[PDB]
Amino acid sequence: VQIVYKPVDLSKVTSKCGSLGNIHHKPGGGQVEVKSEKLDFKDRVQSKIGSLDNITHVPGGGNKKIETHKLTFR
Amino acid sequence: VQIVYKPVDLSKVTSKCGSLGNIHHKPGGGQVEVKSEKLDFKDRVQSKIGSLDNITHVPGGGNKKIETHKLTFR
Amino acid sequence: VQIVYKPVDLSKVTSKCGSLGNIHHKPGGGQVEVKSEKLDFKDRVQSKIGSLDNITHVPGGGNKKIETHKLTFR
Amino acid sequence: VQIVYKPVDLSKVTSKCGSLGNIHHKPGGGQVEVKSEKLDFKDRVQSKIGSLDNITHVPGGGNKKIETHKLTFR
Amino acid sequence: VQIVYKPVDLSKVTSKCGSLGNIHHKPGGGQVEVKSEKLDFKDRVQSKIGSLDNITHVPGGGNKKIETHKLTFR
Amino acid sequence: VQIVYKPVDLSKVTSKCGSLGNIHHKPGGGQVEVKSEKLDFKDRVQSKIGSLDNITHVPGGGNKKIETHKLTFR
Amino acid sequence: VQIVYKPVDLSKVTSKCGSLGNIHHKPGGGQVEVKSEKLDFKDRVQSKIGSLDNITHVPGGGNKKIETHKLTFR
Amino acid sequence: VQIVYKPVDLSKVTSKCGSLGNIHHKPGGGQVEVKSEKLDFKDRVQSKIGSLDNITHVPGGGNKKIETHKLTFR
Amino acid sequence: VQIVYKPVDLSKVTSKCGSLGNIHHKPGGGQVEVKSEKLDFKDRVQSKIGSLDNITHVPGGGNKKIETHKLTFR
Ligand SMILES: [Cl-]
Ligand SMILES: [Cl-]
Ligand SMILES: [Cl-]
Ligand SMILES: [Cl-]
Ligand SMILES: [Cl-]
Ligand SMILES: [Cl-]
Ligand SMILES: [Cl-]
Ligand SMILES: [Cl-]
Ligand SMILES: [Cl-]
Ligand SMILES: [Cl-]
Ligand SMILES: [Cl-]
Ligand SMILES: [Cl-]
Ligand SMILES: [Cl-]
Ligand SMILES: [Cl-]
Ligand SMILES: [Cl-]
Ligand SMILES: [Cl-]
Ligand SMILES: [Cl-]
Ligand SMILES: [Cl-]
Ligand SMILES: [K+]
Ligand SMILES: [K+]
Ligand SMILES: [K+]
Ligand SMILES: [K+]
Ligand SMILES: [K+]
Ligand SMILES: [K+]
Ligand SMILES: [K+]
Ligand SMILES: [K+]
Ligand SMILES: [K+]
Ligand SMILES: [K+]
Ligand SMILES: [K+]
Ligand SMILES: [K+]
Ligand SMILES: [K+]
Ligand SMILES: [K+]
Ligand SMILES: [K+]
Ligand SMILES: [K+]
Ligand SMILES: [K+]
Ligand SMILES: [K+]
């Protein structure tokens, strides 16, 4: 047999942005009171009380190309 | 047999933006009171009490191409 | 046999935007009181009490192309 | 004689309020013209002409208990 | 004689408030003209002309107990 | 004689407030014209013309207990 | 001959104003589409297409006196 | 001959203003599309397409006197 | 002959202003598209496309007196 795997990719993933910015975070915490007695946990606990967790992600591009190729015999 | 896998991709994924910005987050926490007694958890707990969790994602592009190619024999 | 897989993709996915922005988030928490006694949980718990969870996603483009190609023999 | 003054006070005077606020005072003065000639005052004068006197009293509670106890011999 | 003054006070005067605020005063003065000629005052004068006198009293509680106790012989 | 003055006070005067604030004063003066001729005052004068007198009192509690006790013989 | 040009001008042109203001211009453009083909103009053209042309003239006085005096011999 | 040109001007052009201001211009453009083909102009063109031309003239007085005097022989 | 040109000017052009100000310009551009082909101009062109031309003139007085005097023989 003759098997030819010859895909052609000339594709563009592209951005232009002029000005990127002017982002202001001023979150304000509240008043939090937690009273706990006789609590049983048998498994994992993720707990957050009054926290101000922030992610700022501001890439000038942030473009992505995911591409996958296989030729496969089982 | 003769088997030919020859797909052609000339595709564009493209953006232009002039000005990207002027984003203001000013969330204010409230008043939170939690009283807990004799609670049993047999399995995983995710808990958040009065927290101000933020994600800001501002890519100048943020374009994506996902593409997948297979030739396969079982 | 002769089998030929020759699709051609000339496709455009495109945006133009002049100004993107002027976004203001000012949520205010209320008054929350929770009293809990003698609760049993046999399975996973997700709880949020008075939290101000925010996601701000503002891509200048945010366009996507998903494509899949297979030639397959079983 | 035996005289016993033994009153018992277990009284509650109580408030709960969630949010107290959003008060806007925007009074605008008019046009006032006063012309006075040959006036005699023999006694105290309180005069106000075109004034914008304000009291804003906004207690979160503002509850009161007044109590009086006497045992008295003349 | 035996005279016993033994009053018992276990009284509560109490408040809870969540959020207290958002008070705006924007009073605007008018046009005031006063012309006075040959006025005689024999006694005290309080005068206010076009003034914007303000009191803002915003106690988070502002609760009060006034109590008076006497045992008296004349 | 036997005279016993033994009053018992276990009384509470109490407040809780979460957030206290966000108070804005922007009073604006008007136009005031005062013309005075041949005025006689024989006694005290309090005068205010076009003034913007302000008191801001914002105690987090502002609770008060006034209590008075006497045992008296004349 | 004796010729005398002796006019006397004692004239007042006067204004009093207390507060002049509180002017808000918020015009919004609509949608305008103009398609033009094979037009000949032999003479001057003044054209405006979707413009938001504004004059704000707010003199505190803005009073005027125009006067003319001539004595003339031909 | 005797010719006397002796006009007397004692005239007042006068203003009083207390407060002059509080002027807000917030005009917004719309959507303008102009398509032009084969247009001939033999003479001057003034054109404005989607412009937000503004004049703000706010003189505290802005009063004027124009006066003209001639004695003339031809 | 005797010719006398003796005009008398004791005239006032006058202003008083207390407060002059609080002027805000926030004009916003819209969306302008212009497409032109085969246009002929034989004379001057003044063109403005999508511009935000501003004049702010705020003189504290801005009063003017124009006065002209002639004695003339031809
Ligand atoms: Cl909170
Ligand atoms: Cl916990
Ligand atoms: Cl908090
Ligand atoms: Cl809350
Ligand atoms: Cl919990
Ligand atoms: Cl829970
Ligand atoms: Cl009076
Ligand atoms: Cl008034
Ligand atoms: Cl006033
Ligand atoms: Cl008076
Ligand atoms: Cl004033
Ligand atoms: Cl006075
Ligand atoms: Cl035209
Ligand atoms: Cl328009
Ligand atoms: Cl426009
Ligand atoms: Cl044109
Ligand atoms: Cl042009
Ligand atoms: Cl524009
Ligand atoms: K909080
Ligand atoms: K907990
Ligand atoms: K905990
Ligand atoms: K909250
Ligand atoms: K809980
Ligand atoms: K809440
Ligand atoms: K007033
Ligand atoms: K008076
Ligand atoms: K005033
Ligand atoms: K007075
Ligand atoms: K005075
Ligand atoms: K004033
Ligand atoms: K427009
Ligand atoms: K045109
Ligand atoms: K425009
Ligand atoms: K044009
Ligand atoms: K042009
Ligand atoms: K523009």
Residue numbers in the entry:
A (entry chain H), B (entry chain B), C (entry chain E), D (entry chain D), E (entry chain K), F (entry chain G), ...: 306 to 379
Q: What is written in the article reporting this PDB entry?
A:
Abundant filamentous inclusions of tau are characteristic of more than 20 neurodegenerative diseases that are collectively termed tauopathies. Six tau isoforms that range from 352 to 441 amino acids in length are expressed in adult human brain from a single gene by alternative mRNA splicing. Here, we report in vitro assembly conditions with recombinant tau that replicate the structures of filaments from both Alzheimer’s disease (AD) and chronic traumatic encephalopathy (CTE), as determined by cryo-EM.
Addition of 200 mM KCl also led to two different filaments with either extended or C-shaped protofilament folds. The filaments with C-shaped folds comprised three protofilaments, which packed against each other with C3 symmetry (filament type 10a). The cryo-EM reconstructions of the threefold symmetric filaments formed with KCl, with a resolution of 1.9 Å, showed multiple additional spherical densities inside the protofilament core. Another pair of additional densities, similar in size to those inside the cavity, was present at a distance of 2.6 Å from the carbonyl of G335.
